[PDB]
Design a protein around this ligand. Structure first.
Ligand code: HEM
Ligand code: HEM
Ligand code: HEM
Ligand code: HEM
Ligand code: HEM
Ligand code: HEM
Ligand code: HEM
Ligand code: HEM
Ligand code: HEM
Ligand code: HEM
Ligand SMILES: [Ca+2]
Ligand SMILES: [Ca+2]
Ligand SMILES: [Ca+2]
Lengths: 140, 142, 147, 145, 140, 145, 142, 147, 140, 145
């Protein structure tokens, strides 16, 4: 899942969307905005990071950590042993939060709702495969 | 007759004229200046919403209520059962206020005149607007 | 206390105007119907307050017109957020109309707020939930004031 | 020329004015039924040959009406590129050649029904440009019929 | 599938992407470009409409008919009996072509690769539901 | 947020509209007296505690009125930089802590008197933005009172 | 009542509407077209300044005189002793000209209407303008 | 003969409008009072011409209103410099009003001109004395014509 | 000192300089910048308002209070009894600080160094007279 | 101020110059290992406390290196908004407080290792702005350590 060619499209289009964004904080906030809009039950999971005000420093910080996590993972997609280690680390940071598969499918739809709106070219399937690669590493 | 095609034109031009925010107040202003200029005895019916000062907050809110009532009806012109139910409530909201029956044809003329001035005379169709406005005031007046 | 700000109002008016069908009532009926379904699901008793408009038959003309009226009421108020002096008059009006309705209480507006907060994310592109919750409070508090 | 680039651009502009952001996606059915009503009168063609028998209450006809408006939208929006437009017209021509009883005159009657209904809903419409560009469309759809 | 609220997002975002496109011919061509890029076996199905030159009038015409079909369907999404009739008509125009489910999934991915690149707001799930509504009506 | 950047910019804009090039430097006294009149009614505070005893004919009070409008002008014109504004509010807070009988509620009553008089002289005023930004000012001036 | 706050608003909006140079003539034009349309018998009072041709030099100078008289009063609204002395002279300048008392409320309405059209209805306050204009014509009419 | 030119008029109107208090009479009283003080200092007899408006008490309402009238008269005329056809009518009017005043002579307008030429440099930023002297002549000659 | 005509020039030119300034905080800071540059001994008098960082909120606040004081005084220059009362109030807020005449002459030079740089027209003498009016009211 | 807006913008600009469209997503690992090599020397900290024991051949450490560069990228790219940056620093501060043997000095040593490696790969780097903005980051991450 997420083969060597699919990684190229995802890395490129991540760069042209996230890596060229004027306001990385807004971009990261839009992503969690969608996720909440897609799955309102997800929002309460973030009571620890000041979700109540999505423009708080505390919540903007969380959003930046996650898109930062997304960025460091997409860059190591070709380094299978490095990312597996990094994914297992992320899995341990999510295990206590009792997440389910609907949470990860919602995050993926958020991811793929936000990313193409900052592009001229989008490969849906390549992105679905490689989001699954990450979510599957994080969900366990 | 407010025909299928009449309704389409009245819908499209109403949407363009009604617009957004404070610009709705512009439309409303044309109406009441014209109405109270032609029928200055009607102004007394609006004592509770300060009809003597149409630029006040009380009358501006009333003005915007009317425009919304009008917007409901234009939006429902294709759905007569819903249209009738909206006019029935509008009818309750106007009865036993001593409103002279001449106030309605006069309001229709002021409203059509304001819309024509917002969208442009050359784009305008008085027959379609008169037919559909009459179907609306026929449900209210009484 | 968190305020419906100038920027909060622009977001709401943008989300609203962009999901708005300017010329046709089908869409605003669909929005209100999902709202009431949500509202009645959270508070099965609330439905009895709407017997006068055939709430037990949500697909009837009688109830679909109540739908148009509520949505219209909201559209007018939302569009007045840039003229709050005017907005205040209009909410005091909505307030009195709801005082005349036996059973309606401020608690119902909290459920109504939850119903819109659930439905708008499904009709509105790029929906700002924070701006909506704060300006819906601004509007709804004005209607529920006094009851 | 007959339906020049400037003619086409006006027709596309006014067609789009009719189907603006408010009216697009809700008014096609009422438009198309009005067009057919105008067309049945001027052509004398039988509604029975159409799906749902011309019955504007019949879902079969409403969808038939939906296709016709769409095909018109498509042909009109391609007026600026005549090579692309000729191909779309030829496809429509082939589809109607497979249909018993479609005549060149009835095709002209339907194209003109579109102009006249557009003018009824858009009084500023440039009825000459529409006349020129609908006759070009009608000649393509009704070629050899 | 494709409920009354999901129809609103799809109709709006179809309008802001397809309905605001400068060059409807290019937009329609991009869609079949992706489809072919996503599933190279799909391309030969279009030997009748001059697929060999994707800039031919014959092939641009086909692309316009399909996005036109998409447009007339999305506009009647709320009129259940009308669209079912229209979908059944489209199904009959595709039945002889021996298409399979991979063809319709590829078309959907093409649809959802092209559409968001012309938007600022995209609801992935709403679009998946309502594309399924159409494809299921056409595939039979 | 409560009194956002957009809220502040509107309040500053409308405050400046009231004190435009024609009215600045001649209308402060009539404004401030009107504000105090509104304030004495809503607060029930005694004019006797003020210099000149609230006597709008007394030069001591007119100057007191002049300071109050100025301090408001200063606080308002600093709404766009909240770090600077908090310091100005704290200075005013310290000055009123040195004064017997200044309560948090009376401070709110004076801040609201400014909004209402501004709305009386500027009917288009955005009374919500004023409400938000005057309550932020009133909380700073009346903190711990 | 033309209150302290009324005077402030009338001062500020008058200054914005009155303006500079030929643009003052624009304001004056709105007034007399409206006044002579509503009360066309008043036009004969202006025979010496060519009231039949309001675009002439004679009437334009008179029009600009009135606006200046009005500007003196608006500027003096805060100084009643000076205000009264200005109205006294204005009163001499209008007496024994056969001016019907109805010409004044009508002039006030035309003037307020012109000002409203110059500064914008949404910014406008009819109560403040009517109260202060009445204090001015009460000093002139008689 | 030196003319109040198009450029002369722009300077004067700029100096005037920039020293002008649009909404308040205090400033234009202060300008007129320094003007009359100057005028009466140069011509102690002139003051007797203003007995009808209490010239012997320059701080009285009665005289301060005469101050507003003169300044207003000048402001109207200055503002008409771009429509001189209109300006001519207005000066012929001012002319007649000053003919009805026993004692007023063209020589007084020269002293008046000196009084403004002394006072304007003290209220007006970047004051163009040449443009003022020529357009004040243009105006004052029209009022003093015939007397 | 500061007669009725001199007040007009000062009020106008205060408005066109201070009243039209893009950044009233910068303008007020420039004024105390000059004062310090003109008289380095003056700076230590402001140790209570965070003078050590002239861009501090505490020191910007002080600068705004003073130019605000300047503004409210210049506007009441024509209301002799009001400004005398207000000047006596300001004098009492400065009496404990053991200021001397060199401090007030330095402030005046600062005032008249900063103000004309934001104007096209400046009347030096009118400003000297009316600054003296204020300083004399404040110094006692 | 220390790491002003202009300082921050330069650091972000040069950090982005290092990670331009060519180098982003392929050079993070070689950068981070170089940073750690510099850091182990200057700090004297044991590689054994790190995942994979500092072994740049160990996938556990390469991922650890990947997190550290990312967290730096995130903190740096947030330098223009100090409220957001302080929160990110506090999260990192809390994460390292949970770790036995992280000292304030070692944190300074790691922040400085980032500047020096950036200067090695970007000779034009403004080493003063980096010094100021990395010390602000190091004080946030190593607060109370
Ligand atoms: C698949 C992609 C995801 C990535 C890359 C990701 C990344 C992260 C990161 C970097 C953190 C911060 C860890 C730290 O440094 O403390 C975090 C925390 C968290 N994540 Fe995710 N995450 C993902 C998916 C999800 C999903 C699907 C949900 C739930 C719908 C979720 C819920 C949370 C929660 C609840 C926290 C803890 C917030 C707190 O500290 O209170 N994450 N995530
Ligand atoms: C298309 C025609 C009209 C529409 C859509 C319309 C709409 C409305 C609406 C929505 C209200 C608010 C009802 C409420 O909440 O109490 C209202 C009130 C009212 N309307 Fe109309 N109206 C129309 C014609 C007229 C005319 C012609 C008159 C009189 C000449 C009139 C006089 C009034 C009065 C007196 C009220 C009550 C005012 C008050 O609240 O004190 N309306 N109208
Ligand atoms: C922002 C929130 C709301 C808006 C904009 C709104 C608007 C309206 C409007 C325009 C009407 C028609 C008034 C009339 O014609 O007399 C109405 C009626 C009514 N409203 Fe609301 N409303 C809101 C919230 C609520 C809530 C939360 C409840 C109760 C749960 C409620 C209960 C009713 C009832 C019982 C009626 C009368 C029903 C009938 O006409 O038979 N409203 N509302
Ligand atoms: C401007 C002229 C016309 C246009 C734009 C037009 C357009 C269309 C379109 C787009 C279709 C759908 C084709 C398909 O997908 O199978 C269609 C079908 C059809 N048209 Fe026309 N048409 C025109 C004139 C006419 C006329 C004049 C007649 C009758 C005399 C006619 C009779 C039919 C019939 C019977 C069908 C087939 C219905 C079915 O079997 O499903 N058309 N037309
Ligand atoms: C689900 C969305 C689809 C829509 C709205 C659609 C629409 C259309 C339309 C309008 C036509 C032209 C019919 C005519 O007027 O003659 C057509 C033809 C055709 N479609 Fe589709 N289609 C869809 C999906 C697909 C898929 C998934 C494939 C294959 C991967 C496909 C293959 C074809 C072929 C082979 C033709 C015939 C071309 C020819 O005439 O030689 N379509 N389609
Ligand atoms: C928005 C609220 C307020 C503002 C902006 C404001 C502003 C000011 C300012 C600028 C001063 C001058 C300080 C100085 O230079 O010494 C002042 C003084 C004073 N204020 Fe306020 N004030 C407010 C509310 C109040 C309230 C509510 C009271 C009374 C209950 C009050 C009572 C006084 C008194 C008595 C003085 C001192 C007069 C003296 O001893 O010279 N103020 N205020
Ligand atoms: C605020 C209200 C008014 C103001 C400020 C005003 C102002 C003036 C002024 C300054 C003059 C010049 C006096 C002179 O130098 O002889 C004048 C003349 C005159 N005004 Fe008025 N006026 C007002 C209302 C009216 C009205 C309501 C009427 C009649 C409807 C009127 C009729 C006249 C006439 C007949 C003259 C004499 C015309 C002439 O010179 O032949 N005025 N007015
Ligand atoms: C540009 C120069 C002048 C202007 C614009 C001007 C303007 C005016 C105006 C508007 C009036 C009121 C007319 C009325 O209400 O009847 C007036 C009155 C008068 N003017 Fe002048 N004037 C000027 C020069 C002079 C000079 C130089 C003198 C004599 C030295 C003078 C002597 C008088 C007198 C005696 C009156 C009547 C005083 C009264 O009302 O009791 N004027 N002037
Ligand atoms: C002549 C024009 C001046 C004006 C309008 C003025 C105005 C002010 C104002 C408004 C305050 C703040 C009072 C408060 O609300 O607490 C103040 C404080 C002060 N002024 Fe001035 N001032 C002037 C001249 C000077 C001069 C010439 C100096 C010294 C060179 C000076 C030194 C101070 C000091 C030391 C403080 C106290 C700062 C503190 O709170 O620690 N001022 N001034
Ligand atoms: C500028 C200074 C530093 C930055 C930016 C930084 C950044 C990070 C980040 C982003 C993580 C991952 C946190 C997580 O997701 O759990 C981390 C973990 C860690 N850091 Fe640091 N760090 C810094 C300094 C240091 C220093 C000086 C030491 C050692 C003395 C250190 C030791 C560790 C260790 C041992 C872990 C945890 C590995 C694990 O248990 O998974 N860090 N650091
Ligand atoms: Ca985009
Ligand atoms: Ca794009
Ligand atoms: Ca300069």
């Amino acid at each position: 899942v997420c083969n060597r060619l699919e990684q190229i499209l995802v890395k490129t289009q991540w760069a042209q969307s996230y890596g060229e964004a004027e306001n990385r904080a807004a971009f990261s906030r839009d992503l969690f905005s969608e996720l909440f809009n897609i799955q309102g039950s997800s929002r309460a999971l973030f009571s620890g990071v000041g979700v109540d005000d999505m423009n708080s420093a505390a919540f903007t910080a969380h959003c930046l950590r996650v898109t930062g996590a997304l960025n460091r993972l997409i860059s190591q997609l070709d380094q299978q042993a490095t990312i597996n280690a990094d994914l297992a680390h992320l899995a341990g940071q999510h295990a206590s939060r009792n997440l389910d598969a609907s949470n990860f499918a919602a995050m993926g739809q958020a991811v793929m709702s936000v990313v193409p709106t900052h592009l001229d070219c989008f490969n849906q399937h390549a992105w679905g495969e490689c989001y699954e690669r990450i979510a599957s590493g994080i969900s366990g | 007759d407010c025909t299928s095609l009449n309704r389409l034109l009245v819908k499209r031009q109403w949407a363009e004229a009604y617009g957004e925010g404070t610009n709705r107040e512009l439309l409303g202003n044309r109406i009441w200046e014209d109405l109270f200029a032609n029928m200055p005895d009607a102004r007394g019916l609006f004592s509770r919403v300060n009809g003597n000062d149409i630029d006040s907050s009380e009358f501006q809110a009333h003005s915007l209520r009317v425009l919304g009532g009008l917007d409901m009806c234009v939006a429902s012109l294709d759905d007569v059962p819903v249209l009738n139910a909206l006019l029935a409530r509008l009818n309750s909201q106007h009865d036993s206020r001593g409103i002279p029956a001449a106030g309605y044809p006069a309001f229709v003329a002021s409203a059509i005149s304001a819309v024509r001035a917002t969208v442009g005379a050359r784009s305008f169709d008085n027959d379609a607007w008169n037919s559909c406005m009459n179907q609306i005031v026929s449900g209210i007046s009484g | 206390s968190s305020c419906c700000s100038s920027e909060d109002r622009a977001n709401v008016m943008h989300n609203w105007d962009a999901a708005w069908s300017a010329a046709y009532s089908d869409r605003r009926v669909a929005l209100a119907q999902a709202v009431f379904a949500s509202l009645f699901s959270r508070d099965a008793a609330a439905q009895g307050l709407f017997s006068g408009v055939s709430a037990d038959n949500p697909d009837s003309a009688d109830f679909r017109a109540h739908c148009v009226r509520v949505v219209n009421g909201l559209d007018v108020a939302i569009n007045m957020l840039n003229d709050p002096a005017v907005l205040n008059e209009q909410l005091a009006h909505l307030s009195a109309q709801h005082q005349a309705r036996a059973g309606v209480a401020a608690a119902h507006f909290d459920v109504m707020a939850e119903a819109f907060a659930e439905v708008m994310p499904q009709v509105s592109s790029c929906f700002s939930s924070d701006s909506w919750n704060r300006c819906f409070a601004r509007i709804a508090n004005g209607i529920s004031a006094g009851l | 020329e007959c339906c020049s680039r400037g003619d086409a651009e006006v027709v596309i502009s006014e067609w789009d004015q009719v189907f603006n952001a408010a009216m697009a996606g809700s008014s096609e059915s009422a438009i198309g039924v009005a067009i057919f009503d105008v067309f049945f009168t001027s052509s004398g063609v039988s509604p029975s040959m159409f799906p749902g028998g011309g019955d504007s209450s019949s879902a079969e006809f409403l969808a038939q009406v939906s296709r016709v408006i769409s095909g018109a939208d498509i042909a009109i929006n391609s007026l600026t590129n005549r090579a692309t437009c000729d191909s779309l017209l030829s496809h429509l021509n082939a589809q109607h050649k497979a249909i018993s009883g479609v005549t060149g005159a009835a095709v002209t009657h339907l194209s003109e029904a579109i102009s006249s209904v557009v003018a009824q809903v858009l009084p500023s419409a440039h009825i000459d440009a529409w006349g020129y560009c609908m006759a070009y469309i009608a000649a393509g759809i009704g070629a050899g019929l």
